[PDB]
Amino acid sequence: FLKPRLVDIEQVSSTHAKVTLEPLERGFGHTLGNALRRILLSSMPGCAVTEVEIDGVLHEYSTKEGVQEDILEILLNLKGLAVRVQGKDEVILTLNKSGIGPVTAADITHDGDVEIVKPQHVICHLTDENASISMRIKVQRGRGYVPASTRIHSEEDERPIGRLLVDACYSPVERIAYNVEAARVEQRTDLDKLVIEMETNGTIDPEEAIRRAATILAEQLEAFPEFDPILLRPVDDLELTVRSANCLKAEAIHYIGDLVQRTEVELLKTPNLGKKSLTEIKDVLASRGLSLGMRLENWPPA
Template sequence: MQNSPTEYLKPRIVNVEVINPVRARVTLEPMERGFGFTLGNALRRVLLSSIPGYAITEVKIDGVVHEYSTLDGVQEDVVDILLNLKGVALKLHNKSETILTLNKTVEGPVTAADFETNHDAEIINPNHLIAHLTKGGKLNLEVKVEMGRGYQPVPARRKSNQEDKTLGFIMVDASFSPINKVSYFVESARVEQRTDLDKLIMDVETNGVIDAEQAIRDAARILMGQLSVFANLESALTEVEVKQAPQVDPVLLRPVDDLELTVRSANCLKAENIYYIGDLIQRSENELLKAPNL
């Protein structure tokens, strides 16, 4: 129980319910009132945007110049093939990018299992459909798989990878996030006589590249890393240099009357708006000679 206003309850009961291989429901309780929504929303946003994953970013298909082409012997056009390739879930080991090839000449469906993988790449959903071949059809393609974070459309990636673009490859929008869906619920929890506590339930579904429980742990670590900066906040006041006004020679502030000029000369200077010695020294000799009656 809470002993002082500066102490906060921490979740003591953590239950992980595995619904299927790619979906799990995690329950944490008890939490102080309001913390369920605060942490649930923060975890959900991090899960959807910041968990790294892998995606096909470029595709090269034999006989295809652009994405609006068609292939003989293939039921789908190139646009449909590219859309289907985006749904392939992959995982790389010890690499941040690689090239995979697919060569199919047998009539029937073409699936992700037809990719020629090596020990560095793993296909998570081998039954994912890519295309259908009719009699005599063939499909030969290469794909570039990269590691990334979030969603990166082609225009944004084209600007940053202009020099690295491989000839013949078609760039595709890349969704690197391994998280398909996240939802959270907050219910009431009770500890002894306190009934105003929260219970947080996180429901996470992935594409199989990462399990839901590990995804929540990774999201929590990301949040902790970002918030640690605020926890270790130190005053970093820098001394502001005060600019001192330049020192002025007091002689320049003396009136021209102190120069013991004739009355006519003094009046002439004042007619030219010269009242102090500082005003006088700012005028050139030619300007003074042009002054009337001087």
């Protein structure tokens, strides 16, 4: 019952390599190999660029003066930018350039965990002498394919309209192929080899990918009503002034339930709340059938 292990890892390019496995029993090259191909293609860490805020751009459907590329084209180019990070799950970079000529991926400011695999990669061109583009490229890490459309549900104030969300291309793997040839080790009846020839963008090492693949594969083997809802709404739902909201939050009042417990006395004793603010709060609470000094006794359940 001989278990396989790895052998020479031949790197033919920054792009792709052929990893090999020596001790493989009868027919196991296929069973291990295809299953490895699956996890390799499907589940792998990736760092693909997500959010991009550009200079004078409100939407991806405009054209910036001085660049022959449409903004959508520039986003699509950025999506194909391959970067690798170490300690950060999400880093934000800053791109800046001007004058006549191509803007490559090496024109960005270099950060601690930033590694650009393709410095020659073209983001967009520059057509005029004085024409300049600055942008924040927000690069985060994830698995699988996360389109830009499903990215908005949580929402939570993506208000900086200058920020264009882009589809997540997270995955080092491009092409994976596995070939089993009979492998003759010195003494043994008949054994097989596993030549997995994979294709990458350079952002993941072959040994690393081949490792995590079987890591996950084995990892799967691990198994073979009273009260008002309005009381739990955040204070922002009351739509108070910025000052009042910040003051309340500073007094550990984050929800409506917390506010309706407080009395006028107690609120006036706070360092930042005047009569105007209290008038506002009483007004907005009364407008929704609430008030101060309200008791609900049992704060909180769970």
